[PDB]
Every structure is written in structure tokens, then in C-alpha cells.
Design a protein around this ligand. Structure first.
Ligand SMILES: OC[C@H]1O[C@@](CO)(OC[C@H]2O[C@@](CO)(OC[C@H]3O[C@@](CO)(OC[C@H]4O[C@@](CO[C@]5(CO)O[C@H](CO)[C@@H](O)[C@@H]5O)(OC[C@H]5O[C@@](CO)(OC[C@H]6O[C@](O)(CO)[C@@H](O)[C@@H]6O)[C@@H](O)[C@@H]5O)[C@@H](O)[C@@H]4O)[C@@H](O)[C@@H]3O)[C@@H](O)[C@@H]2O)[C@@H](O)[C@@H]1O
Ligand SMILES: [Cl-]
Ligand SMILES: [Mg+2]
Lengths: 552, 921, 99, 50
């Protein structure tokens, strides 16, 4: 009667009661890291590259405009629906990174320090993770729900709103998590997947840099650049913070995208993709699953643009062609080029990721688009085909860390807040841009031979150190970020921060319709397309709580 | 049950479709009972009683020889069935078990009769041919089409990196017209794939053979009886490398001890079924791959795409490579009982049933390499094992009493149920020999993975039910249940489900002395509630699983807890943890279907012209519902909750005419026609915007039929540029494209322009059996129809646009050879284009079609060698017959596919031609 | 701190078919039986097994193969044999005296 | 028709054995006593920790 319906208990799971336990607390912090390598999928790389197709760095690529149609629409800024499955996707996905970081914190809050000497260091790790999610989430959507109450009960999540805080108070909440991390993270983390203190400082400084170009008006246009914020970018990129955790610029530019040089001194914080590791095919970077070129039979997404390729040209003395670079294509015999081109972009006639036996061609063997999306290939996230680190599951994936913060990113974030403060520190932004620039100048290991073999002419020199105008120094900073971080999916995000998106990519739309048919119907709509729409399924379920962005 | 709502089945007609599955024969035989199945050789179906009862499981409950089971019928011997009644309202079914909500099918197997030693041998053999051959472009049509789509866009039609070279120009009006065309001998630059013109549906299909043999033996003494059935079935499906077989044995027996007081008996069936099944989505692959791809390469190998052809695989390869993935299934089923009669009218009997199945299989991964369609060189094997061990025990007391005027029966008792499942599996990679002989787990060189879990549930159920009849004139019945369940916490375990029913046999009221033309006429009315607990064995709980990452996952997103926290790059075991799979609900209770049913029976001249009609109001409340989480809740926010409700009203009518004619011919009719409306009343808010049950997540399904859908409206196609400019501003519209309606007249076509465009319900379904019997010869036809049903065509995306598909250059149906252009303006089909700029894939009225039909589900013709000739062979029964199943279909002119009963991608329903006999001593 | 579980499964599927003919005859003095026939046998075996290590809860309830954090191993093979056998045997008895 | 159960708790602690058993045998004599048809059949679930 009663002995009978209590006998059958659940198998192979841990229950709501038990997961609190201290025995499991460190399982939850790992599980919370895991989802960064195991929660994305081929259309939702926590690289946000699917969504960086909007930019002038690249096209989506693939079979054609119906191979991922919702991402075409983002690429031309026409046709985007708020129902679109992809936007609901990334929105749901990043909030489930958060639940892991939050469940860990709900258990870690109950721990006692005298018997768990790490307690706070572990809380900081989890909080850092939590900011990473909100940050990217904020980048995608602007008007996001802050989930920072780890002891909040399930039914409390319907009474949440993405307008509880204001667009700046929302940015400050992301900083509150990164700030805490700075205070309590170790100086050096020996378990390299855990962020160290300089990583929290880096992401914190990144958060302020995005918080300072303010949009306190009701639309997405800029309402000034907050002085007090930029002064916090410089604080938490102080060379002394970074030197305590040993980070710096790699000797040769290419190391940040090779698997032998994983976890370098420029890898400030990086997702630890792994192989031969207990899992089914391995914790490979499935997110880049589609960007492998046709030479593996699929799929040919994430193709760099003729805009970006020409962006690597330089003039007689080795400086970019700010005005004219994009008026005739790069031709290797006669133009001067930044080495960084042959680290970012695998072009026809050249080796595929430094393997002189895979030569790339305007061919069924490399591009899937029959010419539509061009014939360029992304090199950063792809690897040598003979790598021990590549493996075909359902797509071709590898063990190559995605670096969330390259140390070059902190030097350019520092040089940026310097140039915006305009307080006579401009000669230091230039020294910063010059570090990034003359490393690139001599990043010819793995491509040393490219002159005699192909006639390429590397010319890249650092800028003379005068007291540049705020704006004239700005374009040299903007150009350095364009060539340093090509195809790493934080380009379009650069522009929406600057309030420049509608202008440069609508201009990219018409220069690049010559090179890529798809951009012929394209139109970026000011105060609308700077941000993905908040997903309609979320809005409609919140009962008027959640609020759309200006434009829909 | 004389007060219920009970469709009875003529089990004789059942075998005249030669189905393996008895339920597949009942298709359309019973009003209100929608039986639905594809053409696959196991005959497996799904039953739906009275619309769509609830939001979780709608599968009915079978009670075979007193034992419950919710699965099978296609796993058992349909040939040793003797009785089948479907019980449709809450009252008649409510007492047969704790799971009646979705209807209750009583099934009674054969057994020996007092004083008889009969024996029957039945034996059949059929051929099955592919009916619904979907017409897809050949290598030259695919050439004409691609030229059109290329020019319609004004780019050079020779810029195809395929083997095509064109010869074209402009006519008088300056329109693109095509003259001739030339094609390469080889599809790729290295000349390793010949260009071909294959008919992939001719290739992947064969002529199936079906085959059945049953042997029944009986024996009946006064002190007990016994039965013994033997039987085999073998169906080679119409898809190559798919088959099914069943071996079956049943032994039933009873013993009458201690005069005829103490009785002891047992039913028991034994079954080994075995199958290799069609792979997931081969029909869609066969639609997609161009004719130009050859079955085989220049060398021996299988053909695939090379150079510039689409990302689609070899359908003859996949069907071969999967030819060895055979499960084999052993299901023991039966009961045992004791029955005591301490004094006349009072019986104490208790049954004990056993339903145990095990299912072994080895699934083989071989390396493939058709064209650019690689696998690397993966080899692996997975040895899966599964167990379901169900058992039931009950005990029953019954006193019947006839006062003199009156009659009355009483029953009380209790029932116990416990399913205990498990399943485990060993997977290993790398094999130096790729045969099922070498490919065992000890022969592996590579990595392995282990998998396996278990679960179960126990059921307790106290019940009573009581009857009465004044004097064959006025009939009452009442039932009261108290059902508990393992799935719920202590605070909601047991609910209480009472039911009432009435009946008035108006003909025995000799106030109808007069009317002689009318033998019976009976008015009955039901009200009852039936509990539903058919939910996850883990619904109550908050589920944290450790999920390392060890399982296959597509495109990523394994949601694994393991992570290289050390930066190792792996090589060794990683630290891991726990993810959340769900969130608890302490307060889940039963869901309750309440069914109210009214009906009348009747019987007219000589008891020819018989039938019955019924009207129900079926309502499920406190519906148990897998309630999606809120977005910001994130991972594993699903939880079970009793939020939701749904109703189901309708009419069920069966009516048949018997009579002989004086010239030897006998003719017997048996039609039936149902209808019903289904509406969702309430629903939690996440389930609403989920669209899970209807809204496509644009609108909410509350107020509409379960599965209703929302989309745009296809006002034809733009025919000239001024219909575009005067239309609402619509992104990507031009002369050629589909015009979409402006439903809020805001002057722009955006996503707000969608309304309810699909309702899956039929405006009435029906079926009719005709029997003719003239001078030994017997002929039977069973028709079945469904008029009113809407149908969402996903094939139309492949037959009406060069680019309503995610990847370029797929094969496309034949229809687009008839698309619009300047040159051909008498067509609905929008002009070919290479790019879907008008998003013609969006949910349109374009894809909603009249899927109504009437099929000749079966036709049979036989001869019965008269007893004079057969009985010198010393035989009671000698009959030869021959049948056709699904021989012919009739459908709407505005339906573009082949089989409207299966428009898209499921296993084609084939046409069977059958031969057989019935020896019977 | 080893924990692990191994889920083993084994199958033996043996079957036999034979057919027999027998004529017995009582002459009057004598008696005699004759039998001929054939028999077929086929055993087909198999056995397979999944093994996994590491369990955060050490009960038969938690300790299934999906709950494992550690390394796994798979095992399993099959084998069999078929038998054919033609036979006869014949009897006699003079008169309950000599058999 | 045979039904039967056995349960032996061994003399070593944490060792036992059980057996559930069912047998149904039956013959039929058809066509006077010429044609005969029959079946024997036993069903068993044994379970042990050794
Ligand atoms: O349309 C609404 C629909 O979108 C969904 C699901 O599709 O999004 C949710 C969720 O699903 C994904 C991934 O799981 O959807 C994939 C999505 O990505 C795109 C572009 O974004 O590109 C996919 C590319 O993959 C390929 C690769 O094929 C491979 C190569 O390694 O070759 C064979 C052939 O498939 C495979 O073994 C390999 O994967 O295609 C896979 C893609 O194509 C589809 C088309 O149905 O599968 C092909 C299969 O379909 C069949 O017809 C029937 O099974 C067979 O012919 C064949 O097996 C689709 O199921 C697969 O996802 C390459 O061709 C593509 O370039 C889009 O094209 C694609 O839609 C994620 O985006 C997202 O997170 C749901 O919400 C909703 O159901
Ligand atoms: Cl719980
Ligand atoms: Mg509108």
C-alpha cells in the first residue's frame, strides 16, 4: 500500500537536495567552466562569429544565402525578423552559461572559509564567468536581463526585466562581477583554464571601455563619452597589473592561432578545448565547425572580405592606406602588405595555414559558393590538415583554444582610452600601437620565404612619435585594431561601440557589392540594427516585463 | 458494457488485410478511433481515441486476457485474437485500470470450447510495390531548370561549375529561351565519377515479399480446456535493406477443480521479433541527390558528389551500410489466475500478469567515402541491450444477485503494477576487418564508451464498480476509483475518480407494444473521470546529471560537464561535474480527464439495419505538462506542472445493413462515420510562446486546435513590376516572387502579418465495409475516407522553387519545370530563382493543401470448396483467397503530392497483392 | 579510491530440429522396431558488456554507466556451432526370449 | 500447468538464490487418433549473488 510506491528511487542522477553538498561544490565550478566549451554549436559559437558576419571583416559563406538564412539577413541588415530562431538561440544559450556559474555560487555562498581556504577565489572565478556571459549577451542585445542573484528561486525569474537597470547601470552590473574577480583572483593560476587576476583586470577594463561610449538616450546613438570610465580602463590595464601575471605579446604574431603554442603569454584567458579526453569525440571547438574550407568536404563559412584583405595593404614607408586602400584589390607583385594578412587570411596561390603542400585555389576544392562568397579562407580558427589536434566528428573541429582576451587587445584598449582622454598621454597610445605594430612588422617566422617564393613585399613600420590630434591618432588606433583582430568576431562590436556602424558598413555595402553579389540589396538602418532584437519568444513570455530595442 | 460507449470489432474481418498488426487492420474500422501508420514492414501503428486526449501520452490501454499493456500488438500474434472492443467514454473504460484516459481496448485471445477439438491453418503470401513514386528531375530536366533559374536572375547560365554548357539566346520579345545543351562525361576534374541519369527511387526500392503462417489447435473437456498457437511472419519492406519477422507461440489453459467451484488458469504468448529499419530521412535524401550522381564510381566504389555538387549522400550506400543493424526482441506475455465460487453468485479471483521483453542489437558504423561525403575512416560498433520487466497483480470480489424483478452486480478490488526498466551499451571504435563477424567490442583498437541507466514506477489502485437493472428496462452503473502512483509525492499520490452511467431500454417499456418494425432501442448517458499519471519517472524531481560528454552530439552542444581546467589539451580523463536537467515540483498531482457521453443504440427490421450514435464532451484538466523554462533561468529549467486543459467534443456513428437475396447472394454492409473538434483551453505561458503545441511561437494556441499553425498568406505571385510597387513594401519582392498579404494594412509586410492558416482536424472521417457472398464465393471491400484534413507539405519546398532549401543545387521535384516567367505566365509556381530573397520558405498558405482522401484500404475475393468436397478430405473448412491492400487512392486535385495520407517523407505506403488459404479440420 | 560498474549481458540461443520414422511389427512369434531420422542443432551465443569508473555516489542506484566520470571500456564477442546427425536404430525379439 | 518458487539464503552472509518457474505442457489428438500435435514448455527466472 505505502511501502510499495517509495521503493523506486531515481537512478544515475543527483537530486536537488544533494547538489548543495560541499563534496560537489568543486564539481559545479568545473561544470560551470565546461559549458563554455560544450554549450555552443555550429551556429552559436561563443566566439559570436556567426554574428560578426554583419561586419566588413568577412561574409557568412557556405552554399548560398539559404545556408543559414537568418545569418544572411544579419549580414545585409535586411530581412531580420525578431522571431528568427538564431536570435532566440544565442539568447537562451548564454543564459545557460549563467545558470552554471550561478548554481556554483549558490553552493559556494554556503561554504565556510576556514575549512575551504579557496571559497572566495572560487567565487571570483564563477563571477568572472558570469560577467563573460552578460558582457557578450550585452554586446549582442543591449537591453539584457541582469541575473546576478545566485540565491534567487526559480519563480523569481518571471519578475525579472531587461529594463530594471538602465543601459549604464546594466554595464556597471557586468563590471561588478569583473571587479570582484580582480580583488580575489590569484595572481597566477597554475590551472590555466581558470582566469588569473590580470584576466579580470583585462575584462573589467574591456567592460568600462564599452560602458563609456554611452547610450543613455532612448535610441542606440552615442550620448557622449564618459570621462570617469576611461580612467578605469587605464587603471586596470596598468602594465604592473599585467606583469604580475606574466602576460605579454607573443614573439611571432602567428602563435595565438597555432595549437603547439596554446596557453602562451598572450593568452590572458582562453577556453581550453581538448582532445583524447574521455569525451565522445573530444571537447573540440565545434563552434568553428563550419569555417573549415572545402578541402575537408565542408563547409566553407566565415570567409574574409576583399575589404579586409585590402585593409592589410600599406604605403611606401609601411603604414596603412587609410584613404584609398580599398579602391583597387591587393595584387601581390606591386603593393606592400602587413604580414598579418598571411596569418589572418588564406588567399588563393598561398599555403593553407603554413603547409606548402595545401595550396589554395579559386576552385571547387576550396570554396563552396561557386564564387559568390569569394575564395578567401579564415586561418585563425583553422589548423594544418595534418594536425594531431583535428578530427572529424559531425564537422571538423580541433583542440585550439579560443583566446577570449589576447594581450594585444589590452594594449589597444589602453591606447584607446588614452586617445579618448586626450590628456597628453597620446604619445603613450602611440607607443602602445607601436608595440602591436612592430611585432607584426617582423612576424615572418613560418612565412619568412614568402618573398622569393611568391614575390610578396612586407612593409610595416611603427609611427613616429609626435603629439597627434585626438582624431588623427584615432584612425591609426582604429586601423591597428582592424588588422590585429581580423576575423576574430569583435569588429562589428567595435563599430556599434563607436557609433559608426551604419556609416562604415553601409559604405562597405556599396564598395563590396562589386565583389560579393549578396550585398546588393543591403541596408543598415540607424537606431535599429546596432543590436539584435531582443528575441520575440522572450518578450512575449515575460508579460510586458521585457522591452524591445529602438527600431522594431 | 451495456451502458457505455463501446465500439465492437468483428475480429474475422481483421485478418482479411493480412496485417501483422491487428491494430493496423482496425484502421478506419471504428468511429472515433484514429489508427495511423506508415508502410514499414512491422505494421506498427499508433491509436488515437476521441481526438487528442492530453498533452503528454495519448496512447490507449490494451487489456489482453486481463493483463494491461500500453505497448505492442505488432509484437504479438494478431492471429490468436478472438475479441476486440474499444471502450471510448470515461465510464466503460474507467475501471479497467489507472490509465484509461485515452481509451481502453479489451482484447481476448482464443481458447478451447467445451466439447470441441478444432484446428486451423492459415497461410498467406503477398508482394508489395512502391505506390507513391515522387517525380523528381532527371539529368536533363535538372539542366533545363538550372538554366532557367540562372537566366531568370540575369547571370550567365554557363557559370555553373557543373558539367553543363548551354546554347541559348533571345526570341522576338527579348526573353531568355534555351535551344540545346551539352554535358560532360565525368562529374569532376579528375574523371573519377561518371555523369549519370539515375532514378534514385527506382534504385533504393524493391518489390517486397510478405509471408504468414498460423497454426491453431484447441481442445475442450468439461473439467477444463486448452489452446496452442504457432505462427511466423516475414515482411521484406519496400525500401531495400529493411525487413521484419516475428515468431510467435501461445498456450492458454484452464482447469475446473472441486466440482466447478475452484478454477485455475493461464494465458501465455511467446514472441521473437527482429527488424532492420529504414534510416532516418533516407526518403528526403533520395529526393535531394541529383540524377547526375552515379550509383557507383569509375572504380568499384559507391558514387557520391564531387567537384561542385551538393552535400548529399548516396542513398543506396546508406541503406547498405545499415543493412546489418538488426535488433532482435523477445517478449513474454501472459497471466495466471485462480477463481473460487464459495457460494452461487459470489466469486473471488485474482490474476497475476507478466510482461517481460528484452531487446539486443549491434549497430555498425562503417567508414564511408562517397565523393566529398566522407566519414574520416570511422569504424565502430555499439552493442545495445534493453530490458522491460512489467508485472501486475490484482484481486477481485464480485457478488451478482437476481432478486426476481431486479438484477445487480457488485465488484471491489485492488491492483498493483510495477514496471522496472534498464538498458546498457558498450561502444568501441576502430576495426581492422569491417564485417559483422569481426566487428565485436573485443576486436576494437580504438576508444570506448559505456552507457546505461534504469528507471521504473509502481502503481496502486483500489476500485469498486456496481450495476443494476430494474427489469431489462432501466439500467444503472457506478464506478469509484482511488489510484496512487510512484510518480507523485506522498501529498498528491492518490486521486479519486468516480463515474456514473445510465440506460433505458425503451423497447421493453411495453408502452411500445405498437412498434414492431423496431427490435431494440436503448438510450445511455455517461459521466466519469479517468486519472492520468502517464509522465516521466523523474517529473517530481530536480535532476542534476553528471553528463561527462561521452555521448554523440550534433554540431556541438553536448552540454557536458567535463573540462580541461588545466590547459592540457586533454590526453587523459578530465575533471567533470553536474548539469541540471529539470527542476522539481513537490505538488504534481494527477491530471483528470472528465468525459460526458450520450448515445442511442437501435435495431430495426428482423434485426437488419443496426447501429448506434454517440456524442461526447471529453475534457482534460490539471493537465500534466512538460513546462519549458524561462530564458533567463537557462539550463534545465523545464519542470512538470499541472497547468493546462483541453477538450474534445464530437459524434460517432456506426450503422450496417444485413440481408439475403432470394437468388443466393448475401450482402452485408458496415459503415461508420466520426467527427470531432479539439480545442486547447488553458496553457502555461512558456508552453504558449514555445509554440510547442501550436503557435509556431508567434501566436498562442489557447483557443485553437492542438497542432494548429500560424503563417503568412500567399496572395498569388507578382506578375509585373507595378504589382510590386503598389503592393505593401515587402523585402525581396519582385516580378516573379510570391505576394504576401498585408493583414494589418500598415503598408509593410513584416512578421506581424501572420494568422491561423492550418487546422489538422478533419471535418468528419469515415469507413465502410461491404461483404458479398454468392454461391461459395465471398468478396470483401473496406473503404476508408478522411475529408476536411489540412496537410502541411514540406515536399512543395522542393518541387516549386530552385532555392527553398538550405543548400544549393539539390534535386527538385518536377513541378518547377512549370514555373512562371515572361515566356510562361499561366502558372501559380513562382519563377525560378537562385536566391530566396523573398524568403519563400517562410510558413505560407502555399504549403497548406487539401490532404483529404478515400482509399480502398483492402479488397479480397475467395472461394470456399463446398463442405461436400472438402469433408471427404476430412476437413471442416477449405478456402482459397486473394487480396489487395491500399490498392487505390483518391485525393484532391489541389494536392500536389502522391499519397495524401503520407505526403512527405515517411515509409511509403505500398500496394500489397496477396494469396492464401485457410485449411481447417 | 576505485569505483566502477560493469553491466554484463549474455545470450545463449540453442535450438534443435529433428524428424523421425518408425515402423514396428509383431509377426506372431517375433517382434521388431525400426527407426531412421536426422537431427539439426545450432547454438548461437553472444555476450557484451560496458564498464565505467568513478562515481560521486556509491549506491546501486547512482552507479550506472551514464553516471560515470572516469574511463570506460567495452567488451563482447560471439560464437556458435551447428550439428548434423543422421541416425538409425533397429530392434528385434524372437519370443520374449532373445532380444 | 506447473507453478513454482524457491529461495535459498545461503550459509555465507550476502549470498542467496531464487528461482521462479512455470511449465505448460499440452497435446492434441486430431483426425481420430492419427494426427497428434503437442508442446512442452518451461519458463524460469533465477537470480543469485554468489
Ligand atoms: O529550419 C528551421 C530549423 O533550424 C533548426 C534546425 O535545423 O536550428 C536549430 C539548430 O540546428 C542547427 C544545427 O544542428 O541547424 C543547422 C543549420 O546550420 C546551417 C547554416 O547555419 O548549415 C548546416 C551545414 O551542415 C551541413 C553538413 O552536412 C554534412 C557535412 O559534415 O554532410 C552530411 C549531410 O548532412 C552530414 O552527415 C554532415 O552533417 O548540413 C547539415 C544540415 O543540413 C540538414 C538539412 O535537413 O541535414 C542534412 C540532412 O537532411 C536530410 O535531408 C535528412 O536527414 C539528409 O539529406 C541529411 O542527413 C540539417 O538537418 C542539418 O542541420 C551542410 O550542408 C550545411 O551547410 C543550416 O543549413 C542549418 O539549417 C543549428 O543551426 C541550430 O543551433 C531548428 O530550430 C529548426 O528545426
Ligand atoms: Cl529534489
Ligand atoms: Mg504588416
Amino acid at each position: 500500500c505505502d511501502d510499495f510506491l517509495d521503493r523506486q528511487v531515481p537512478q544515475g542522477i543527483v537530486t536537488g537536495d544533494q547538489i548543495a553538498s560541499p563534496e560537489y561544490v568543486d564539481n559545479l565550478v568545473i561544470s560551470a567552466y565546461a559549458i563554455w566549451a560544450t554549450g555552443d554549436d555550429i551556429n552559436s559559437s561563443f566566439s559570436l562569429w556567426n554574428y560578426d558576419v554583419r561586419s566588413d571583416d568577412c561574409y557568412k559563406g557556405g552554399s548560398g544565402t539559404e545556408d543559414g538564412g537568418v545569418f544572411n539577413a544579419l549580414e545585409i541588415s535586411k530581412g531580420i525578423n525578431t522571431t528568427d530562431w538564431n536570435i532566440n538561440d544565442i539568447w537562451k544559450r548564454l543564459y545557460q552559461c549563467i545558470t552554471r556559474a550561478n548554481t556554483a555560487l549558490q553552493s559556494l555562498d554556503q561554504m565556510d572559509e576556514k575549512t575551504y581556504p579557496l571559497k572566495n577565489q572560487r567565487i571570483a572565478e564563477m563571477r568572472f564567468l558570469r560577467g563573460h556571459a552578460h558582457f557578450m549577451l550585452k554586446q549582442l542585445f543591449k537591453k539584457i536581463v541582469i541575473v546576478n542573484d545566485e540565491n534567487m528561486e526559480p519563480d523569481a525569474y518571471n519578475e525579472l526585466s531587461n529594463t530594471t537597470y538602465t543601459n549604464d547601470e546594466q554595464w556597471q552590473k557586468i563590471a561588478d562581477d569583473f571587479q570582484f574577480a580582480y580583488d580575489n583572483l590569484p595572481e597566477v593560476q597554475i590551472e590555466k583554464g581558470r582566469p588569473a587576476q590580470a584576466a579580470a583586470a583585462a575584462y573589467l577594463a574591456k567592460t568600462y571601455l564599452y560602458k563609456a561610449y554611452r547610450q543613455d538616450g532612448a535610441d542606440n546613438a552615442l550620448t557622449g563619452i564618459n570621462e570617469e570610465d576611461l580612467k578605469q580602463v587605464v587603471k586596470y590595464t596598468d602594465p604592473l597589473i599585467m606583469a604580475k601575471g606574466g602576460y605579454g605579446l607573443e614573439t611571432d604574431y602567428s602563435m595565438n592561432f597555432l595549437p603547439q603554442y596554446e596557453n602562451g603569454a598572450e593568452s590572458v584567458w582562453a577556453i581550453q578545448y581538448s582532445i583524447n579526453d574521455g569525451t565522445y569525440n573530444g571537447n573540440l571547438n565545434w563552434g568553428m565547425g563550419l569555417t573549415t574550407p572545402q578541402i575537408l568536404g565542408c563547409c566553407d563559412f566565415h570567409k574574409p572580405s576583399q575589404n579586409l584583405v585590402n585593409a592589410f595593404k600599406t604605403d611606401s614607408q609601411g603604414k596603412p592606406l587609410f584613404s584609398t586602400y580599398d579602391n583597387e584589390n591587393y595584387e601581390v607583385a606591386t603593393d606592400n602588405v602587413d604580414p598579418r594578412l598571411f596569418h589572418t587570411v588564406g588567399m588563393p596561390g598561398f599555403p593553407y595555414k603554413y603547409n606548402e603542400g595545401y595550396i589554395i585555389q579559386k576552385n571547387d576544392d576550396w570554396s563552396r559558393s561557386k564564387g559568390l562568397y569569394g575564395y578567401y579562407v579564415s586561418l585563425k580558427e583553422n589548423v594544418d590538415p595534418d594536425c594531431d589536434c583535428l578530427k572529424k566528428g559531425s564537422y571538423w573541429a580541433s583542440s585550439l583554444n579560443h583566446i577570449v582576451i589576447r594581450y594585444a587587445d589590452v594594449l589597444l584598449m589602453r591606447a584607446e582610452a588614452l586617445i579618448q582622454l586626450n590628456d597628453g598621454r597620446i604619445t603613450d597610445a602611440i607607443s602602445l600601437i607601436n608595440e602591436v605594430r612592430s611585432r607584426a612588422a617582423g612576424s615572418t617566422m613560418l612565412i619568412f620565404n614568402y618573398k622569393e617564393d611568391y614575390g610578396v613585399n612586407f612593409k610595416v613600420t611603427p609611427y613616429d612619435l609626435k603629439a597627434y590630434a585626438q582624431d588623427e591618432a584615432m584612425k591609426m588606433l582604429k586601423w591597428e585594431r582592424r588588422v590585429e583582430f581580423g576575423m576574430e568576431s569583435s569588429r562589428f562590436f567595435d563599430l556599434v561601440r563607436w557609433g559608426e556602424a551604419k556609416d562604415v558598413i553601409n559604405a562597405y555595402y556599396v564598395t563590396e557589392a562589386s565583389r560579393c553579389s549578396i550585398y546588393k540589396n543591403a541596408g543598415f538602418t540607424e537606431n535599429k540594427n546596432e543590436y539584435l532584437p531582443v528575441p520575440f519568444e522572450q518578450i512575449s513570455a515575460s508579460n510586458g516585463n521585457y522591452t524591445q530595442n529602438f527600431g522594431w | 458494457d451495456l451502458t457505455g460507449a463501446v465500439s465492437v470489432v468483428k475480429v474475422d474481418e481483421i485478418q482479411k488485410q493480412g496485417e501483422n498488426n491487428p491494430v493496423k487492420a482496425l484502421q478506419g474500422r471504428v468511429p472515433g478511433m484514429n489508427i495511423t501508420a506508415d508502410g514499414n514492414p512491422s505494421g506498427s501503428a499508433t491509436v488515437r481515441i476521441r481526438g487528442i486526449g492530453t498533452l503528454n501520452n495519448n496512447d490507449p490501454l490494451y487489456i489482453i486476457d486481463g493483463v494491461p499493456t500500453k505497448a505492442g500488438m505488432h509484437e504479438l500474434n494478431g492471429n490468436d485474437i478472438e475479441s476486440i472492443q474499444v471502450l471510448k467514454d470515461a465510464a466503460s473504460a474507467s475501471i479497467y485500470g489507472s490509465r484509461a484516459a485515452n481509451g481502453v481496448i479489451i482484447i481476448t485471445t482464443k481458447q478451447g470450447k467445451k466439447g470441441q477439438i478444432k484446428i486451423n491453418f492459415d497461410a498467406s503470401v503477398s508482394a508489395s510495390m512502391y505506390q507513391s513514386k515522387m517525380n523528381v528531375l532527371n539529368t536533363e530536366q535538372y539542366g533545363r531548370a538550372m538554366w532557367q533559374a540562372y537566366v531568370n536572375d540575369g547571370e550567365n547560365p554557363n557559370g555553373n561549375a557543373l558539367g553543363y554548357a548551354y546554347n541559348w539566346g533571345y526570341n522576338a520579345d527579348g526573353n531568355p529561351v534555351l535551344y540545346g545543351m551539352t554535358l560532360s562525361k565525368y562529374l569532376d576534374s579528375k574523371n573519377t565519377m561518371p555523369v549519370a541519369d539515375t532514378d534514385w527511387f527506382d534504385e533504393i526500392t524493391r518489390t517486397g515479399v510478405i509471408q504468414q503462417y498460423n497454426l491453431s489447435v484447441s481442445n475442450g473437456s468439461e473439467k477444463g480446456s486448452s489452446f496452442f498457437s504457432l505462427g511466423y511472419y516475414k515482411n521484406l519492406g519496400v525500401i531495400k535493406d529493411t525487413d521484419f519477422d516475428r515468431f510467435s507461440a501461445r498456450m492458454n489453459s484452464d482447469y475446473k477443480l472441486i466440482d466447478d467451484i475452484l478454477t485455475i488458469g493461464q494465458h501465455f504468448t511467446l514472441n521473437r521479433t527482429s527488424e532492420v529499419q529504414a534510416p532516418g530521412g533516407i526518403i528526403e535524401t533520395a529526393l535531394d541527390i541529383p540524377s547526375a550522381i552515379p550509383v557507383y564510381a569509375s572504380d568499384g566504389s559507391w558514387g557520391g558528389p564531387v567537384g561542385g555538387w551538393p552535400d548529399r549522400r548516396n542513398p543506396r550506400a546508406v541503406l547498405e551500410y545499415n543493412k546489418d543493424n538488426r535488433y532482435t526482441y523477445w517478449r513474454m506475455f501472459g497471466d495466471a489466475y485462480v477463481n473460487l465460487t464459495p457460494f452461487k453468485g459470489f466469486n473471488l479471483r485474482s490474476t497475476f500478469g507478466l510482461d517481460y521483453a528484452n531487446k539486443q542489437a549491434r549497430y555498425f558504423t562503417y567508414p564511408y567515402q562517397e565523393g566529398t561525403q566522407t566519414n574520416n575512416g570511422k569504424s565502430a560498433v555499439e552493442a545495445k541491450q534493453e530490458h522491460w520487466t512489467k508485472w501486475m497483480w490484482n484481486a477481485i470480489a464480485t457478488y451478482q444477485l437476481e432478486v426476481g424483478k431486479h438484477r445487480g452486480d457488485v465488484m471491489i478490488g485492488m491492483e498493483l503494477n510495477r514496471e522496472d526498466d534498464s538498458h546498457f551499451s558498450g561502444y568501441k571504435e576502430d576495426f581492422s576487418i569491417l564485417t559483422p563477424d569481426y566487428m565485436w567490442p573485443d576486436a576494437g583498437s580504438g576508444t570506448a564508451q559505456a552507457y546505461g541507466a534504469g528507471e521504473g514506477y509502481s502503481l496502486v489502485s483500489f476500485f469498486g464498480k456496481m450495476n443494476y437493472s430494474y427489469a431489462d428496462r432501466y439500467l444503472l452503473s457506478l464506478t469509484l476509483r482511488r489510484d496512487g502512483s510512484s510518480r507523485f509525492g506522498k501529498n498528491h499520490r492518490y486521486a479519486t475518480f468516480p463515474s456514473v452511467s445510465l440506460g433505458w431500454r425503451i423497447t421493453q417499456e411495453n408502452f411500445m407494444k405498437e412498434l414492431t418494425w423496431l427490435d431494440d432501442l436503448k438510450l445511455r448517458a455517461s459521466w466519469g473521470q479517468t486519472g492520468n499519471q502517464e509522465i516521466s519517472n523523474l517529473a517530481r524531481y530536480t535532476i542534476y546529471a553528471p553528463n561527462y560528454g561521452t555521448t554523440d552530439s550534433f554540431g556541438g552542444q553536448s552540454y557536458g560537464t567535463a573540462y580541461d581546467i588545466t590547459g592540457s589539451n586533454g590526453g587523459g580523463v578530465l575533471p567533470s561535474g553536474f548539469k541540471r536537467n529539470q527542476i522539481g515540483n513537490d505538488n504534481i498531482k494527477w491530471e483528470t480527464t472528465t468525459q460526458t457521453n450520450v448515445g442511442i443504440d437501435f435495431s430495426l427490421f428482423k434485426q437488419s439495419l443496426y447501429g448506434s450514435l454517440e456524442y461526447y464532451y471529453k475534457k482534460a484538466t490539471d493537465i500534466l505538462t512538460e513546462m519549458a523554462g524561462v530564458g533567463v533561468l537557462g539550463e534545465g529549467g523545464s519542470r512538470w506542472i499541472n497547468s493546462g486543459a483541453m477538450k474534445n467534443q464530437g459524434f460517432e456513428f456506426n450503422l450496417g445493413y444485413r440481408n439475403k437475396t432470394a437468388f443466393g447472394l448475401t450482402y452485408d454492409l458496415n459503415g461508420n462515420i466520426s467527427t470531432y473538434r479539439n480545442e486547447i483551453l488553458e496553457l502555461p505561458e512558456t508552453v504558449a510562446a514555445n509554440g510547442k503545441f501550436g503557435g509556431n511561437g508567434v501566436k498562442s494556441v489557447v483557443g485553437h486546435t492542438y497542432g494548429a499553425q500560424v503563417g503568412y498568406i500567399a496572395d498569388g505571385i507578382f506578375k509585373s513590376q507595378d504589382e510590386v510597387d503598389n503592393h505593401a513594401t515587402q523585402e525581396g519582392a519582385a516580378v516573379g516572387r510570391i505576394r504576401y498579404r498585408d493583414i494589418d494594412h500598415n503598408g509593410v509586410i513584416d512578421e506581424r502579418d501572420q494568422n491561423w492558416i492550418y487546422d489538422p482536424t478533419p471535418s468528419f472521417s469515415y469507413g465502410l465495409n461491404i461483404y458479398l457472398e454468392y454461391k461459395n464465393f465471398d468478396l470483401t471491400m473496406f473503404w476508408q475516407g478522411v475529408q476536411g484534413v489540412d496537410i502541411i507539405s514540406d515536399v512543395k519546398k522542393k518541387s516549386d522553387f530552385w532555392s527553398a532549401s538550405n543548400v544549393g543545387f539539390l534535386n527538385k521535384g518536377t513541378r518547377l519545370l512549370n514555373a512562371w516567367s515572361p515566356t510562361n505566365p499561366n502558372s501559380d509556381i513562382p519563377a525560378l530563382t537562385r536566391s530566396d530573397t523573398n524568403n519563400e520558405q517562410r510558413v505560407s498558405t502555399y504549403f497548406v493543401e487539401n490532404g483529404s482522401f478515400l482509399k480502398l484500404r483492402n479488397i479480397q475475393l475467395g472461394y470456399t470448396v463446398p463442405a461436400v468436397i472438402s469433408k471427404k478430405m476430412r476437413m471442416d473448412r477449405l478456402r482459397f483467397y486473394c487480396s489487395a491492400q491500399n490498392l487505390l487512392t483518391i485525393k484532391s486535385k489541389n494536392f500536389t503530392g502522391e499519397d495524401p495520407e503520407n505526403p512527405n517523407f515517411s515509409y511509403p505506403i505500398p500496394v500489397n497483392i496477396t494469396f492464401g488459404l485457410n485449411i481447417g479440420f
